[PDB]
């Protein structure tokens, strides 16, 4: 490698300008780099993870630093319900004085941006009641970033260079990560919540100078060693507690009273403490499972070779799977992104319903921004999980070493899987679109009594199976005589019932036929994204149209116009079209969320329950109506604080349309156009003196696909962020 890509001499030996793009895009595809090994692969991955941790700690330190320096956090602590958060100040020298005047919020002497990230609520719930606290945290996270950087530097040096036999130690790694990185980590978080966050909620500030003296509980560790743990749940902040002062506070540190804090409409800090403690016990116990240097424990290899069902249904079972996962980094990455995306969606689905931060339920833009954020993140992470499974099936899947096992016996009936997922998506799309269209028509014919309104009896049954008496099923928690209600009758169910039955909060919302129909739209989206991704992953090795697809790799443009045509045949293109369907699905999810919640917050749940059953309600009563205060962010006569969100709205529209250029138009019209341009530049006087060094070419097909999707997704995300933030901030209900 001679030119800029030092990691691929095939792109360095490219006189065109494709090598710049492909040296950007393959920079982090180490197992495709030239003249490397498995040692160097894992070591570069390890140093890269160090860099990622450094960036994460640096970005958190930037958040803390800007909230401390340019924020109003000390003012937000006093009157949080009526003082606006501040992400960071703004020095944009293009600003006009109306814009300097409009962006001055939260009691600031200059322009500012309102923190729609909820970091204020989460820092205030865990202590951190001064700017100096955030400054110390930011400086410590900067130290941690430098620590990660030096660690990743030295672990690249030959003296500290772990071998592949160390990375593949999938039992010591699992034991350590489970026990320490989850159990001890959540245990330390409890040791913060018990020593700092609860005392900071109960009044007194417990800081590094005085945290050894302050007893978290008036009887310190006697109750714990003597087994009398119930002494830690004696005075559980009996319903009159003001978060941040001793009025109506107590002395408990670990409780299971459940439900919400009445002031904050959030979860109790004692519940979080006991929670992280209990799951710490579970993870510290589970991290002593796998065999290590001490003679006891399990070998995952024999756990998999033992889970082969007699009967040959699964065939060879999980035999040879430890070796095909531990050697395959893409399999580890795919499983990891699967779990991560599911738990990210879980974070969203449980932070909207069970907010664990003070005064985040009552503020309404952060609760939407976070949900939308984590759900789009989960959709991307899930698409990536499947894409890396496809990359595994091409690159690291050895069909001989896992013959007739659960994963080759999987690839056998790929046609069955693809066909039945196709059936599910076809069925759902047909039917639910038909019902939305029937209702659109029945409203268009002035006959809303003829609409197909299916009450979601099953979700309403689960709701009534948790204590919601809004339907009258009276089963397993709404029935007082049920043994499930009798078991936890004295533990959590009073708080949980006065929470779930309270129709102001956002857990277990009262759902109706529109919720049914949009849940089926969601199922269509999930099944279809899954179809696209699974089909790409299983046809990654080959199909009837291109059986030697494993030899062309994961990302290749096509196979030519022969055999009828092979546009978008690669598993990369399955990922591609799945990102489209994923954005669509998460858009449905977040549209449903934002409309249900903005109608709840405004008070008119009837708006959703009547208008969500026909698509013109979404186009009128959600998009057209809630975009009223946004697009008026800057009129011909003046502007307001929502000018930035309107500009971002239109910016996202613009790139979302620009992506259609790279998607609709493909390579050949642009190559010819660039040939004309090159002629003109080489025959235009006073510019003949200037000659390019990289011969200009139109973007490669796979590249331009990626670029179109980048513009498309950036526009999707920025547009909906603008709209969501501006609609929920233009009113705050």
């Amino acid at each position: 490698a001679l030119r800029f890509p030092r990691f691929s001499q095939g792109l360095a030996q490219d006189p065109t300008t494709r090598r710049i793009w492909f040296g950007i895009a393959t920079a982090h595809d180490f197992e495709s780099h030239d003249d490397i090994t498995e040692e160097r692969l894992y070591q570069n991955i390890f140093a890269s993870h160090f860099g990622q941790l450094a960036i994460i700690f640096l970005w958190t330190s930037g958040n803390l630093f800007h909230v401390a320096w340019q924020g109003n956090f000390e003012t937000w602590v006093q009157d949080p319900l009526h003082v606006r958060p501040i992400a960071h100040a703004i020095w944009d020298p293009h600003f006009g004085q109306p814009a300097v005047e409009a962006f001055t919020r939260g009691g600031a002497l200059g322009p500012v941006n309102i923190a729609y990230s909820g970091v204020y609520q989460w820092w205030y719930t865990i202590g951190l009641r001064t700017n100096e606290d955030l400054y110390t945290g930011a400086l410590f996270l900067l130290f941690l970033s430098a620590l990660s950087l030096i660690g990743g530097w030295l672990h690249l040096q030959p003296k500290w260079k772990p071998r592949v036999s160390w990375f593949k130690n999938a039992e010591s790694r699992l034991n350590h990560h489970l026990s320490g990185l989850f159990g001890v980590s959540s245990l330390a978080w409890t040791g913060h919540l018990v020593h700092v966050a609860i005392p900071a909620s109960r009044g007194e500030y417990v800081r590094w100078n005085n945290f050894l003296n302050v007893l978290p509980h008036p009887q310190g560790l006697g109750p714990l060693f003597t087994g009398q743990w119930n002494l830690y749940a004696q005075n559980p902040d009996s319903s009159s507690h003001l978060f941040g002062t001793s009025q109506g506070s107590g002395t408990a540190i670990l409780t299971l009273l459940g439900g919400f804090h009445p002031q904050t409409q959030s979860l109790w800090l004692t519940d979080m403490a006991h929670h992280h403690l209990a799951i710490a016990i579970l993870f510290l116990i589970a991290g002593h499972m796998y065999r290590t240097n001490f003679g006891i424990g399990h070998s995952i290899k024999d756990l998999l070779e033992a889970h082969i069902p007699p009967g040959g249904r699964l065939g060879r079972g999980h035999k040879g799977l430890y070796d095909t996962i531990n050697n395959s980094i893409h399999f580890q990455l795919g499983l990891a992104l699967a779990s991560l995306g599911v738990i990210t969606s879980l974070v969203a689905q449980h932070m909207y319903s069970l907010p664990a931060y003070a005064f985040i339920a009552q503020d309404f833009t952060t609760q939407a921004a976070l949900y939308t954020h984590h759900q789009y993140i989960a959709g991307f992470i899930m698409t990536g999980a499947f894409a890396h499974g496809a990359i595994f099936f091409i690159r690291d899947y050895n069909p001989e070493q896992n013959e007739d096992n659960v994963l080759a016996r999987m690839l056998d009936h790929k046609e069955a899987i693809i066909s039945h997922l196709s059936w599910a998506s076809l069925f759902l799309g047909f039917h639910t679109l038909g019902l939305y269209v029937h209702n659109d028509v029945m409203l268009a014919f002035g006959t809303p009594e003829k609409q197909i309104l299916i009450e979601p009896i099953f979700a309403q049954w689960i709701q009534s199976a948790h204590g919601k008496t809004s339907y009258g099923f009276d089963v397993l928690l709404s029935s007082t005589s049920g043994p499930a209600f009798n078991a936890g009758r004295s533990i959590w169910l009073p708080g949980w019932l006065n929470a779930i039955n309270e129709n102001s909060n956002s857990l277990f919302l009262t759902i109706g036929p529109g919720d049914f129909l949009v849940h089926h739209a969601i199922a269509l989206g999930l099944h279809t994204t899954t179809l696209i991704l699974v089909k790409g992953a299983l046809d990654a090795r080959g199909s009837k149209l291109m059986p030697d697809k494993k030899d062309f790799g994961y990302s290749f443009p096509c196979d030519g116009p022969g055999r009828g045509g092979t546009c978008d045949i690669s598993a990369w293109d399955a990922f591609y079209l799945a990102v489209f369907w994923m954005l669509n699905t998460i858009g449905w999810v977040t549209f449903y969320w934002h409309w249900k919640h903005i109608t709840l917050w405004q008070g008119n749940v009837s708006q959703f329950n009547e208008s969500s059953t026909y698509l013109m309600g979404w186009l009128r009563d959600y998009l057209w109506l809630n975009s009223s205060q946004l697009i008026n962010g800057y009129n011909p006569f003046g502007m307001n604080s929502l000018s930035v969100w309107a500009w971002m709205f239109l910016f996202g529209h613009l790139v979302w349309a620009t992506g259609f250029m790279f998607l609709i138009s493909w390579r050949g019209y642009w190559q010819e156009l660039i040939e004309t341009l090159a002629w003109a530049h080489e025959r235009t006087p006073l510019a003949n003196l200037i000659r390019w060094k990289d011969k200009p070419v139109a973007l490669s097909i796979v590249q331009a696909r990626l670029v179109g999707l980048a513009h498309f997704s950036v526009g999707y995300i920025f547009t909906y962020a603008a709209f969501l933030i501006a609609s929920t901030s233009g009113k705050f209900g």
């Binding site: 006959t447 809303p448 009594e449 609409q451 009450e455 009896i457 049954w461 009258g472 099923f473 036929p513």
Partner: protein, 154 residues
Amino acid sequence: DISGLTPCKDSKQFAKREKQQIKKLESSLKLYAPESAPALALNAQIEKTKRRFDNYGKYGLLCGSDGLPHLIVNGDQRHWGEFITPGILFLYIAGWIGWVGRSYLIAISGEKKPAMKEIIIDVPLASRIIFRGFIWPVAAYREFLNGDLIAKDV
């Protein structure tokens, strides 16, 4: 009275929907003479609406707070007219379509060029088969037991 839904025969908002649609159609009725074709058609649509609302009342449909009939699919015996009886009515016709189509494709499978029979549909053959899907729930069951429903790989 299930799922918190009042029946439509004893709902207030349902009758309000009725009254509102009738007043809407009557506001468009005071512009023509009461014996001409437009007024007669409007009165026919009015009776259509009134009988529609009364029929949705008398069938025991459940009208929610919005005052529109919410169909119950869970399997309640009172609400099998919502999904399960028309669901069987569907699946009987849908399997008719599939079974006559399948027996047609199997009928032309032993042809020299079968594809021309998918373009130029052999109407005598199909018409002799078009009623053979009346008995699909039993013929298909036997073809599944005999092994003739699902093909073998070879």
